[PDB]
Design an enzyme around this catalytic site. Structure first.
Site, short mmCIF file in Angstrom:
data_model
loop_
_atom_site.label_atom_id
_atom_site.label_comp_id
_atom_site.label_asym_id
_atom_site.label_seq_id
_atom_site.Cartn_x
_atom_site.Cartn_y
_atom_site.Cartn_z
N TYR A 63 0.92 -1.19 0.15
CA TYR A 63 0.08 -0.10 0.06
C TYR A 63 0.74 1.34 -0.25
O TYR A 63 1.50 1.40 0.92
CB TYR A 63 -0.94 0.07 1.34
CG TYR A 63 -1.63 1.04 1.62
CD1 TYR A 63 -2.79 1.53 0.75
CD2 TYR A 63 -1.15 2.04 2.41
CE1 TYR A 63 -3.64 2.66 1.01
CE2 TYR A 63 -1.88 3.28 2.75
CZ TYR A 63 -3.12 3.70 2.11
OH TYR A 63 -3.93 4.62 2.02
N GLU A 89 0.07 4.86 -1.34
CA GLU A 89 -0.51 6.03 -1.54
C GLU A 89 0.65 7.20 -1.49
O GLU A 89 1.58 7.34 -0.49
CB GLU A 89 -1.48 6.49 -0.63
CG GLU A 89 -2.67 5.69 -0.93
CD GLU A 89 -4.08 6.16 -0.17
OE1 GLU A 89 -4.08 6.96 0.92
OE2 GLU A 89 -5.18 5.86 -0.79
N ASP A 104 -2.54 11.75 -27.09
CA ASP A 104 -2.71 10.19 -26.41
C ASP A 104 -2.08 9.33 -27.59
O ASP A 104 -2.56 9.27 -28.59
CB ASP A 104 -4.43 9.97 -26.39
CG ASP A 104 -4.28 8.54 -26.12
OD1 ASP A 104 -3.39 7.80 -26.00
OD2 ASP A 104 -5.61 8.11 -25.76
N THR A 129 -1.05 4.28 -22.88
CA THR A 129 -1.03 3.13 -22.36
C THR A 129 0.46 2.70 -22.23
O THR A 129 1.35 2.93 -23.18
CB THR A 129 -1.92 1.88 -23.16
OG1 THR A 129 -1.35 2.12 -24.60
CG2 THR A 129 -3.35 2.53 -23.18
N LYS A 189 0.61 -2.10 -25.73
CA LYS A 189 0.38 -1.86 -27.08
C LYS A 189 1.95 -1.95 -27.60
O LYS A 189 2.53 -2.88 -27.46
CB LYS A 189 -0.57 -0.73 -27.48
CG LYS A 189 -1.84 -0.82 -26.88
CD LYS A 189 -2.81 0.12 -27.62
CE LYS A 189 -3.90 0.32 -26.55
NZ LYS A 189 -5.13 -0.58 -26.74
N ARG A 205 -0.68 -3.90 -19.13
CA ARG A 205 -1.59 -2.85 -19.10
C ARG A 205 -1.82 -1.68 -18.07
O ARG A 205 -1.67 -2.23 -16.91
CB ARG A 205 -2.75 -3.78 -19.23
CG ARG A 205 -3.06 -4.68 -20.06
CD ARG A 205 -4.29 -5.46 -20.38
NE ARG A 205 -4.95 -4.81 -21.55
CZ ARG A 205 -4.70 -5.07 -22.99
NH1 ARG A 205 -3.80 -5.87 -23.06
NH2 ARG A 205 -5.47 -4.32 -23.68
#
Lengths: 402, 404
Positions: free
Chosen positions: A51, A53, A187, A213, A216, A222
């Protein structure tokens, strides 16, 4: 798969069948790809337990995910030359949303190539105006883009996003954006690997914001990423967290680092040069046999075929016919398509994944031959069986993950 | 790890160090956990390569035969665990799950009534909606449902949210539903903290009463990091289209397969036994800390969480406490106690949770020793010999209960 076969046979068998599906079909699914074993090992690590954050240096037990996150960021800078990088977005859409939330107020006008799939957030909370492509050239018309920008006065202009098969000239978008006092977002999801390899111009030279992304053409896990000018760093970071995300996926981020390291290798450029050669070979071979290609060719890894105009089959028909012989592609709306969106006139073919498994020019010339055999003879079982056997020859020649 | 070691030594090294840090430290970070090797194997699979926009049987790109199997199994097991009418396993995270619900239940600007303990807003829920907070009563440090009802009547929320905060006591979802019905609000429960307890039958199931239930798949549910929405059938169309194409694109199918694996684990009888131990361990920790002179927020706990008022007990800030404990090998978070008089990045409290240590095998005897270690370090924060003693006692427990 030791632990998973013991724990959960039914999931383990499905995973193995998915591997075998990827192996036994020649997938030509747009910009999709096969990641390395290294990338998968990172995604499958104990970093999923963490975790984390906040951001490196300002999150706590985060000393080591600070290393993998910071190296993701470093490598991203080395690849793309961006002033500020955020590797936390969970996906492309999350990267995109954060940019819109920073660049725009709700209700503002945005000018972009096509509205994704209005249900989509970009069309719902903003006035999204599309420029698309010209009906005659089937390519961007910068005069048309400029006229729309002068008429609608967007606060943000977006380039890229669409699975477009020709080069996009970011300098001309920047010129247009400056003329109307708009920020510019690109993008680059489809083309990021080509950008990384120097085979498509880099939008970071011109854009306020670049999203992508990590999968690709970039061949990573991903996920998403935002690059931006230093002036937007504070707003971009706080928008990702705590704005629209919580803790980052540190296992995926480590896997982003691994992929970015791969993209910095000399052989990645060789790889992407092969991707683009393969796409040109495929298009040309199809052209030689009478298939019309949207825009008459490609500058990248994508090949869009107008099957309706060439041989009278719908995109849906072409897709199913090809799937039945072992080639996976998708039906595609061609520009100003007369056929309904469910049926379409086109199919879209992409070379990254088949290139990753080893396909070269000779292999893609044979793929062209197979496609032509199947599509021109869609009701002839002997012809179809032949095509399937020729697909089988290629898959056996280039097995997945050896 | 052989491929990453061969190819990218720096990353392999950091990952190995992370493993060792997890092993050498006693992590008591609220609801966090250790997933199984089966779960990791699913996340690390070739399903990462698969583009699967849409939902099972209704995909936009083909070749989805097998991800349809894994996604459908994740859905079916989620229904067996929680009894939900509709399940969406695609949300990338808890906050994506939450955003989708708010987009469905609300128009921009609408009033929402929700819990906050941590206290324009930066969070989407506060920035684009009129978010009214309830917390806990100043004297009991528990939810006062008459006050919740008063706020609902005063503000006329279109949505009331229960859960979400790291609250140590049982939440009465019946009372929330009664309040929501009175003001004609929809009810959402964010059960991320308590999802494992709910699955085990140890906390009442909010699915009985709520319009929408969101959760993370990690934390007490002990799955991979990600999100999930459970909802009444009447919202299924709007929920699924808000997730895709509304705010996401393709799902992470490798992670979803890992959800299915976690849900399978959660269906086993030994999962209930694990959760029983989680909750027993937290009671032991709370009661041992009370015997060492620490005040616990709300006087104790009903779940896996123990919130300690360090400032009121020994006069260290939550920040000082967190730091002192990190130096001895115990990981926890500072936190704002109710009506905390210390600044927000200083705070009066620390929050401890038992799920992760319980997963690695700690029992009551182990957690009594954790309380004593915590007391030793915090009461002697400037005493090197006692801190080294704390450190050695941590090392004894981590040696006794090695990870993986």
């Amino acid at each position: 798969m030791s632990y998973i076969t013991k724990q959960d046979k039914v999931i383990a068998e499905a995973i193995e069948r998915e591997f075998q599906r990827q192996n036994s079909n020649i997938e030509l699914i747009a910009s999709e790809n096969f990641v390395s074993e290294a990338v998968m090992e990172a995604q499958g690590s104990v970093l999923t337990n963490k975790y984390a954050e906040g951001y490196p240096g300002r999150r706590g037990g985060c000393e080591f995910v600070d290393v993998t996150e910071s190296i993701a960021i470093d490598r991203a800078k080395a690849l793309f030359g961006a002033e500020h990088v955020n590797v936390q977005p969970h996906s492309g859409p999350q990267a995109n949303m954060a940019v819109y939330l920073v660049a725009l107020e709700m209700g503002d006008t945005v000018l972009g190539m096509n509205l994704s799939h209005p249900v989509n957030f970009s069309g719902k909370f903003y006035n999204f105006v599309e420029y698309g492509v010209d009906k005659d050239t089937e390519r961007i018309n910068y005069d048309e883009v400029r006229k729309l920008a002068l008429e609608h006065k967007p606060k943000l202009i977006v380039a890229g996003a669409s699975a477009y098969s020709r080069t996009i000239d970011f300098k001309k978008f920047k010129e247009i954006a400056d003329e109307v006092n708009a920020k510019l977002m690109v993008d680059m999801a489809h083309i990021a690997g080509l950008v990384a390899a120097g085979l498509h111009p880099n939008p970071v030279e011109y854009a306020d914001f670049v999203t992508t992304t990590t999968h690709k053409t970039l061949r990573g896990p991903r996920g998403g990423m935002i690059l931006c000018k230093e002036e937007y760093k504070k707003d971009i970071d706080k928008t990702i967290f705590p704005g629209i995300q919580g803790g980052p996926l540190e296992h995926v981020i480590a896997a982003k680092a691994v992929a970015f390291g791969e993209a910095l290798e000399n052989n990645f450029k060789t790889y992407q040069q092969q991707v683009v050669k393969n796409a040109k070979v495929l298009a040309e071979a199809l052209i030689n046999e009478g298939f019309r290609i949207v825009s008459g060719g490609t500058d990248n890894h994508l090949v869009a075929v107008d099957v309706k105009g060439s041989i009278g089959l719908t995109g849906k028909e072409a897709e199913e016919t090809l799937d039945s012989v072992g080639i996976t592609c998708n039906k595609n709306t061609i520009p100003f398509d007369q056929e309904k969106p469910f049926v379409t006139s086109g199919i879209r073919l992409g070379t990254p994944a088949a290139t990753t498994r080893g396909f070269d020019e000779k292999a893609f010339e044979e793929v062209a031959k197979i496609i032509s055999l199947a599509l021109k003879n869609s009701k002839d079982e002997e012809k179809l069986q032949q095509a399937k056997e020729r697909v089988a020859k290629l898959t056996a020649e280039y097995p997945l993950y050896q």
